[PDB]
């Protein structure tokens with residue numbers, strides 16, 4: 299009977315495919331469609347960007363692992379979605395009909411917001427994708443051959459601030475390990491955050507003080523409330539505002555090596571569905587992950603819309619992170635299954651939370667924050683070896699699971715208790 303399509307094979311989409319097939323069984327067709335033929339473990343990208351990891355450590359071909367599970371895989375980008383006819387048009391012009399569609403397309407990296415900021419058009423690189431992280435590293439090596447000013451940070455509208463700090467810190471660390479640090483004219487951190495360690499979540503534990511001291515310790519000069527208007531002639535044009543939005547300065551910073559986390563928007567094939575998304579291209583869903591306009595469209599991951607709780611001097615967004623994403627996936631699968639069986643599924647993603655782990659080498663920083671608005675129930679920022687062991691363990695676990703299959707509540711990791 300019912301044909302369920304999962305669009306996008308990333309952090310939410312890959313497990314979604316397995317969980318979907320596992321829940322529906324042999325009487326239903328599950329098809330996974332994605333723009334790339336390989337899965338990549340995104341949290342490892344910053345390390346790739348500094349050459350501490352290789353593509354081969356963090357990426358692998360999808361086909362065999364999902365097909366052996368009875369899942370169909372189309373390594374093709376969706377270009378157009380007709381929600382009325384329920385047809386997806388692929389890059390190669392073929393079309394795929396669906397009865398249920400689960401959108402897990404992740405972020406469009408919106409380099410267009412800042413002219414000249416695209417990794418291919420200037421010195422400002424990116425570590426959001428393994429492709430980009432490889433490019434970043436390559437440029438980093440050029441920096442090593444001809445030392446120059448470094449600029450790392452997060453654009454206006456960014457939501458993934460952790461990766462910016464992680465990358466700045468591991469770059470400094472790598473520079474030192476190479477006895478190359480003191481050869482750098484200047485190393486500067488530019489962020490749209492209202493203050494250091496805001497992280498798009500109004501700060502967590504002592505994120506402010508600890509990240510502030512960390513940057514200072516590494517001789518990284520830091521500026522907040524910044525937006526970049528353009529990257530041009532290897533200069534970054536920065537405007538810094540006050541709490542009221544008024545300009546308080548403009549800077550022109552030269553860049554030999556740069557990495558700025560861009561704003562995320564929804565991908566075009568999805569943003570292009572009339573009435574499906576908010577103006578940023580994010581899918582508007584109810585608490586059950588069901589599209590508010592189309593009863594047979596669900597969504598999970600960065601792709602869904604989550605309303606802001608704060609309005610910062612420079613536009614910033616709140617991060618969507620792995621544990622909450624899996625919780626969205628789990629609800630979507632349950633609720634589609636319920637549709638395929640009469641009921642309206644009642645499962646939700648649960649309490650909003652942000653969880654992030656960043657490895658520095660032998661130790662790391664991690665935070666856990668919930669719910670979204672303060673006063674919170676848990677508001678922890680921690681640094682230690684346990685964080686490094688956690689991150690290493692989790693990468694290994696997730697990757698193995700993406701090869702072996704996922705049947706169950708993803709975090710039996712909480713069995714290290716029992």
Ligand SMILES: Cc1cc2nc3c(=O)[nH]c(=O)nc-3n(C[C@H](O)[C@H](O)[C@H](O)COP(=O)(O)OP(=O)(O)OC[C@H]3O[C@@H](n4cnc5c(N)ncnc54)[C@H](O)[C@@H]3O)c2cc1C
Nearest residue numbers: 306307308309310332333341375376403404599600619620
């Ligand atoms: C650098 C970085 C580090 C991060 N580190 C952490 C971390 O340590 N911990 C944590 O919890 N979270 C982290 N996150 C955030 C979040 O967990 C990841 O961004 C996660 O990969 C998001 O999952 P997703 O499924 O929504 O999107 P993605 O993993 O990006 O997957 C989207 C998929 O859809 C595909 N796709 C897009 N458009 C189309 C289309 N039109 N047709 C077909 N396929 C398409 C893409 O190719 C991709 O496979 C990090 C994010 C970044 C950018």
Ligand SMILES: CCCCCCCCCCCCO[C@@H]1O[C@H](CO)[C@H](O[C@H]2O[C@@H](CO)[C@H](O)[C@H](O)[C@H]2O)[C@@H](O)[C@H]1O
Nearest residue numbers: 460463464467508509512654655656663664665681682
């Ligand atoms: C992961 C979410 C956020 C992403 C940001 C990633 C960047 C993290 C880099 C910040 C590192 C800060 O740098 C570090 O601060 C901590 C905590 O105060 C250290 O360590 C300090 O606290 C504890 C444990 O928490 C130690 O065991 C220690 O002996 C003590 O000195 C400092 O010695 C300093 O080196």
Ligand SMILES: [S]
Nearest residue numbers: 457600617618
């Ligand atoms: S995000």
Ligand SMILES: [S]
Nearest residue numbers: 460461654655
């Ligand atoms: S993160």
